[PDB]
Amino acid sequence: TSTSL
Amino acid sequence: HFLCGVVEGFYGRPWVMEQRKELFRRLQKWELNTYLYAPKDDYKHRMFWREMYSVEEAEQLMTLISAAREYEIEFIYAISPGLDITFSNPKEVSTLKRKLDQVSQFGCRSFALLFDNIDHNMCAADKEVFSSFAHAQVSITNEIYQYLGEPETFLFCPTEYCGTFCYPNVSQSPYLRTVGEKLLPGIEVLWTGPKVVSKEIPVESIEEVSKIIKRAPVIWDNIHANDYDQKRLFLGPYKGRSTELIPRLKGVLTNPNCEFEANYVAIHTLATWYKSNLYSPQMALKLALTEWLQEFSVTLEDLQLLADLFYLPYEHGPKGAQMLREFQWLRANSSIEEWRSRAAKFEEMCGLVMGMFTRLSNCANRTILYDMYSYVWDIKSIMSMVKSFVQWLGCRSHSSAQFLIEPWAFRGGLAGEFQRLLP
Amino acid sequence: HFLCGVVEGFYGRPWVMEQRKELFRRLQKWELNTYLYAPKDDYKHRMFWREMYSVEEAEQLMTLISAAREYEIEFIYAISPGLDITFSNPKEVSTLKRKLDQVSQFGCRSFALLFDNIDHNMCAADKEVFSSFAHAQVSITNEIYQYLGEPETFLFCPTEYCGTFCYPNVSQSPYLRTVGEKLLPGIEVLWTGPKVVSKEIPVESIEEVSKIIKRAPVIWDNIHANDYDQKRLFLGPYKGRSTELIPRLKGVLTNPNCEFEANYVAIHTLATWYKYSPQMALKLALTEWLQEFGVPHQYSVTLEDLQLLADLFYLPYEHGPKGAQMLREFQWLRANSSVVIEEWRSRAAKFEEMCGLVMGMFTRLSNCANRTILYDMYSYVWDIKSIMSMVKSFVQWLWAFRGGLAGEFQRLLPID
Ligand SMILES: *[C@@H]1O[C@H](CO)[C@@H](O)[C@H](O)[C@H]1NC(C)=O
Ligand SMILES: *[C@@H]1O[C@H](CO)[C@@H](O)[C@H](O)[C@H]1NC(C)=O
Numbered sequence: 001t002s003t004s005l
Numbered sequence: 006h007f008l009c010g011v012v013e014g015f016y017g018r019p020w021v022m023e024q025r026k027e028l029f030r031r032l033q034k035w036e037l038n039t040y041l042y043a044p045k046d047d048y049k050h051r052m053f054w055r056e057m058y059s060v061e062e063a064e065q066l067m068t069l070i071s072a073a074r075e076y077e078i079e080f081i082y083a084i085s086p087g088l089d090i091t092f093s094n095p096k097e098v099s100t101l102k103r104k105l106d107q108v109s110q111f112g113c114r115s116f117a118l119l120f121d122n123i124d125h126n127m128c129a130a131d132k133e134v135f136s137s138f139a140h141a142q143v144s145i146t147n148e149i150y151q152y153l154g155e156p157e158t159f160l161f162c163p164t165e166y167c168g169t170f171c172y173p174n175v176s177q178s179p180y181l182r183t184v185g186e187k188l189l190p191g192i193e194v195l196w197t198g199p200k201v202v203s204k205e206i207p208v209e210s211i212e213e214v215s216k217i218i219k220r221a222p223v224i225w226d227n228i229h230a231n232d233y234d235q236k237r238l239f240l241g242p243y244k245g246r247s248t249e250l251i252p253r254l255k256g257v258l259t260n261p262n263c264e265f266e267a268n269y270v271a272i273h274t275l276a277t278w279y280k281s282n283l284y285s286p287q288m289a290l291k292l293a294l295t296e297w298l299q300e301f302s303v304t305l306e307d308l309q310l311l312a313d314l315f316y317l318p319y320e321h322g323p324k325g326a327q328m329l330r331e332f333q334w335l336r337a338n339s340s341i342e343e344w345r346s347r348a349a350k351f352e353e354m355c356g357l358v359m360g361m362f363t364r365l366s367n368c369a370n371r372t373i374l375y376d377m378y379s380y381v382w383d384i385k386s387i388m389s390m391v392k393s394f395v396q397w398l399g400c401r402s403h404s405s406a407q408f409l410i411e412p413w414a415f416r417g418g419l420a421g422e423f424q425r426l427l428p
Numbered sequence: 429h430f431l432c433g434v435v436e437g438f439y440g441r442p443w444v445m446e447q448r449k450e451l452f453r454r455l456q457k458w459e460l461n462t463y464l465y466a467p468k469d470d471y472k473h474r475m476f477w478r479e480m481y482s483v484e485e486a487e488q489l490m491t492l493i494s495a496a497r498e499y500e501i502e503f504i505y506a507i508s509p510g511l512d513i514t515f516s517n518p519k520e521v522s523t524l525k526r527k528l529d530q531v532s533q534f535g536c537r538s539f540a541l542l543f544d545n546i547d548h549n550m551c552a553a554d555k556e557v558f559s560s561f562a563h564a565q566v567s568i569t570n571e572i573y574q575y576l577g578e579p580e581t582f583l584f585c586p587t588e589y590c591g592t593f594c595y596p597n598v599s600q601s602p603y604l605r606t607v608g609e610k611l612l613p614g615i616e617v618l619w620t621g622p623k624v625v626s627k628e629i630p631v632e633s634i635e636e637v638s639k640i641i642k643r644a645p646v647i648w649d650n651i652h653a654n655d656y657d658q659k660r661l662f663l664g665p666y667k668g669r670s671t672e673l674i675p676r677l678k679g680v681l682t683n684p685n686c687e688f689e690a691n692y693v694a695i696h697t698l699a700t701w702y703k704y705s706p707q708m709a710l711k712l713a714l715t716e717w718l719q720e721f722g723v724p725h726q727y728s729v730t731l732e733d734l735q736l737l738a739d740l741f742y743l744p745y746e747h748g749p750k751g752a753q754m755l756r757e758f759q760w761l762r763a764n765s766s767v768v769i770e771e772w773r774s775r776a777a778k779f780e781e782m783c784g785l786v787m788g789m790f791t792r793l794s795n796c797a798n799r800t801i802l803y804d805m806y807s808y809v810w811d812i813k814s815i816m817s818m819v820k821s822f823v824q825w826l827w828a829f830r831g832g833l834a835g836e837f838q839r840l841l842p843i844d
Contacts, residue, residue: 001122001201002121002122002201002233003016003045003122004122004123004124005124005787005791016806016810017803017806017807017810018803018806046794046799046802046803046806048724048795048799052794052795053724053726055726055728056724056726056727056728057727100728233814234830234831234832235658235659235807235808235810235811236658236659236830236831236832236834236835237829237831237832238832314833315832315833318829319829321833325833329833329836329837332837332840333840336840366469366475367475371471374469375440375441375469378439378440378441378469379440379658380658382439382440382655382658383658383834384833384834386656387834387837387838388837390841390843391837391840391841394841408842408843409843411592411623411624411625412625412656412657412744412745413656413657414843415843416657416659416838416844417657417659417660418657418659418660418661418741419740419741419742419747419751419755419812420659420811420812420815421659422755423755423758423815423816423819424815424830425844426758426759426762426819427818427819427822
């Protein structure tokens with residue numbers, strides 16, 4: 001995953 | 006009109022206007038056509054996407070879009086509402102247009118909507134008006150596409166944007182199925198390879214993708230991206246991408262190292278392979294490094310070594326890999342007499358790294374030094390500890406003084422300590 | 429008077445002019461007085477030290493020195509020539525004076541000569557003219573002192589600038605004895621303590637060093653310096669220096685993190701010490717810092733977060749309590765993974781919430797309005813965030829090219 005939240 | 010160049014699309018300190026001018030001037034020297042503005046942590050691009058540019062921010066963007074035309078680089082402006090947009094609510098839709106309107110009036114003809122890396126489900130409100138998640142995005146992407154008078158280039162980055170990320174596979178994915186069929190023929194689709202950071206892009210994988218997307222997709226290429234590992238930098242050649250791909254793709258935009266001046270080799274080698282439609286990585290590199298050397302006191306050998314020490318996310322260079330085998334051999338076979346012989350030549354290979362650091366630091370192009378400083382410093386001090394260790398292993402038949410006689414002996418801070426506990 | 433402030437004295441990217449001016453505002457605000465301009469990789473300071481400032485550089489530098497005076501901060505200009513300078517050659521010596529003069533006409537009235545981290549021995553030409561190494565430096569320092577009209581602040585920095593660097597020990601050192609005896613009564617001597625990065629600077633060590641250089645030293649403090657490790661940042665309080673060092677010293681000048689904005693705790697608390705409990709000074713410093721992080725203005729980050737940041741990136745010999753604690757808890761879990769009584773499930777839970785708080789810290793920090801501060805700390809906060817994520821999920825299970833090449837050698841060294 002590259003990122004989030 | 007096939008799209009090739011840079012996306013400034015990483016997490017972190019974004020580039021400043023002056024760096025992006027020099028970027029345009031470079032894209033032109035080497036015949037690339039495009040620049041996608043999408044830096045994750047320029048707050049108005051993503052975190053506060055609804056907010057309009059202030060007065061002085063506007064002055065900047067316009068002067069930017071200018072120098073783009075002045076160099077005839079095409080400038081695509083991205084926006085990322087993914088995090089918290091409500092797709093069904095019309096005030097939400099309208100703020101997006103008002104924002105896209107503001108930038109349209111800066112001189113901007115080309116646009117993009119990105120939807121990478123968002124929580125995959127919706128709000129209570131959205132799950133009514135819309136069947137699936139993929140429905141919502143395409144509805145807004147289309148709607149927007151219309152509004153802007155259906156612009157010349159216009160990209161869409163899907164939530165599922167690489168092979169790994171497709172549920173359950175590429176071929177029979179509800180999300181991917183929906184996009185190919187519903188999203189407008191004039192809208193391009195960004196794709197990143199089999200993985201987020203693809204080692205290689207098989208021609209069969211992209212042919213495969215073109216299946217479900219119903220288009221030749223645009224590659225967001227993460228080959229030289231370094232935003233995900235503090236210690237890592239990528240001065241290797243554009244590689245693992247078959248020359249045979251140019252026919253089958255609408256474009257490739259390279260998402261490169263955060264450190265601007267490190268990106269010479271990454272963009273050059275992209276540019277040489279843009280031509281040629283085999284193509285040779287080993288040779289493109291040799292070309293880039295000789296041309297690069299003109300900017301900097303440092304020898305070509307130094308740069309050859311430097312690129313070898315920071316090569317590619319799956320591959321070290323020749324000199325770097327060789328140093329690794331050599332130290333691996335030496336550490337393994339302790340105690341007829343090839344060891345002393347090889348430890349001597351290894352202690353010399355280390356000295357050539359110290360040498361490369363000395364010459365870089367005495368050099369005249371300080372913008373280049375500073376961008377890479379902390380990377381070269383790290384490698385030099387590590388080799389210097391490695392060299393000093395090999396000596397210790399060797400001067401050991403006549404001593405049993407243990408390997409410590411200062412906190413740059415115990416590295417990494419807290420993060421380092423947590424890491425050494427994982428397998 | 430006693431010198432307390434900052435030395436910009438590290439390897440790497442030097443601070444820019446718009447940053448240094450901001451430094452000046454804050455030194456004044458916090459009632460500190462001095463700024464030692466020594467940035468190792470700002471060429472013309474060390475590397476091309478002979479070369480004089482251009483038309484445009486001259487304008488930039490002057491504007492800066494103006495701002496020092498405007499803010500009642502003493503500006504000391506340092507030069508590090510001892511790399512390849514020939515001591516006896518008058519071409520060099522006259523090239524030094526001419527360099528110094530030029531900044532003098534920039535408005536500058538205080539100076540330093542730095543001889544740190546340079547080969548112990550001279551060329552034959554100078555092996556002739558001067559008796560020992562010490563003798564050579566003393567001789568030239570003294571001259572440039574008089575040449576400039578013996579000014580109010582003049583600093584000299586030894587090659588044996590710390591305890592461990594002294595031959596063979598501090599008290600009986602050839603080099604220190606020659607500096608102490610023969611360097612002019614009016615010049616001050618820089619000193620970093622027991623080690624390059626001194627964990628403590630105890631009183632007796634200062635009595636020991638003062639005796640052989642026959643003056644009170646100026647501490648060049650590296651407690652917060654971070655130029656020597658890519659993954660390290662120090663946001664803990666000034667610690668390990670007794671306030672009874674003050675009577676025994678001419679100054680403390682702190683050589684702080686490379687990322688400008690990360691120096692808020694490090695400078696605030698040094699000030700606090702200058703007027704002591706490290707824990708209380710951190711609380712004072714973090715509380716004031718919090719105000720610099722906003723939410724951006726919109727026409728459509730908590731104190732507990734800062735404390736978690738500081739604890740995670742604390743001091744070079746010690747983690748902050750929250751940091752140390754998570755590290756403790758993870759070690760206990762990792763040890764008793766065999767046990768799947770189950771107090772473990774109860775503890776894995778509170779650990780996962782601790783990990784949770786690291787993510788939360790990063791998310792909020794990334795929304796804040798002050799992007800100068802965010803950018804300066806980005807890659808550090810990102811790194812701790814990625815690792816705690818992997819630690820969280822590995823804890824629940826109960827990167828091969830990570831660090832690149834450097835990382836791969838580092839895992840083969842055994843000191844790791
Ligand atoms: C995911 O990862 C890359 C590399 O870390 C990051 O630069 C990029 O912004 C994210 N999104 C896409 C489409 O690559
Ligand atoms: C030696 O060490 C510090 C920390 O690496 C470095 O910044 C400084 O320039 C050098 N000199 C002195 C006097 O500390």
